[PDB]
Design a protein around this ligand. Structure first.
Ligand SMILES: CC1(C)CN(c2ncccc2F)C[C@@H]1O
Length: 185
């Protein structure tokens, strides 16, 4: 792909984070803590899952960023509406305002309803995410495999400002402690 020139500098929004997440000083890395991180509750925090939003809001244009997923067993990545549900249980779907892919139990799937199997020969260590607001497109790229396409959501109905979306996943196994990292431009 040739989307690198739309690169944007994403930072994480501490106020949206699940209360167990630990965000680095530079707001570029996030990981699951082994306990509550001693923050107050607020209506923005994701309560049920280890999720956080980017601070940036997008309502036009073309945007590109990259995320490092090295040594993780489970994660979700993509974009979502600014007005997604924060509290309680929900599924990641375009109907609920999410355009995401994930790793879970050694398989990769796109967050359609129902979910779509992805075909990845080279497990990615870094994911590229491309958003074309006007076209209604969210695309995912395998940076480890020379930028090969993973998945394209087209005919997207964003219906609001978009935010970068992250889920570090649970660490029930002891094998999923590694962080998500926003990779330099
Ligand atoms: C008392 C809070 C800090 C948490 N809260 C809620 N948390 C989970 C489910 C439903 C809620 F209304 C409302 C308010 O923002």
């Amino acid at each position: 792909h040739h989307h690198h020139h739309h690169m944007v500098h994403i930072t994480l929004d501490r106020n949206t984070a699940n209360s167990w997440l630990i965000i680095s000083k530079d707001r570029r890395q996030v990981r699951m803590g082994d306990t509550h991180q001693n923050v107050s509750d607020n209506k923005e925090r994701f309560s049920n899952y280890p999720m956080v939003l980017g601070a940036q809001r997008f309502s036009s244009g073309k945007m590109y960023w990259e995320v490092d997923v090295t040594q993780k067993e489970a994660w979700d990545l993509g974009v979502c509406r600014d007005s997604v549900q924060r509290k309680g249980q929900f599924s990641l779907s375009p109907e609920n305002g999410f355009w995401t892919i994930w790793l879970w139990q050694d398989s990769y799937e796109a967050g359609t309803s129902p979910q779509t199997t992805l075909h990845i020969q080279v497990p990615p260590c870094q994911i590229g995410i491309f958003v074309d607001y006007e076209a209604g497109v969210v695309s995912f790229y395998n940076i480890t495999d020379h930028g090969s396409l993973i998945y394209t959501f087209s005919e997207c109905v964003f219906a609001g400002p978009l935010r970068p979306f992250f889920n570090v996943g649970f660490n029930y196994s002891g094998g999923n402690a590694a962080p998500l990292k926003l990779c330099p431009l």
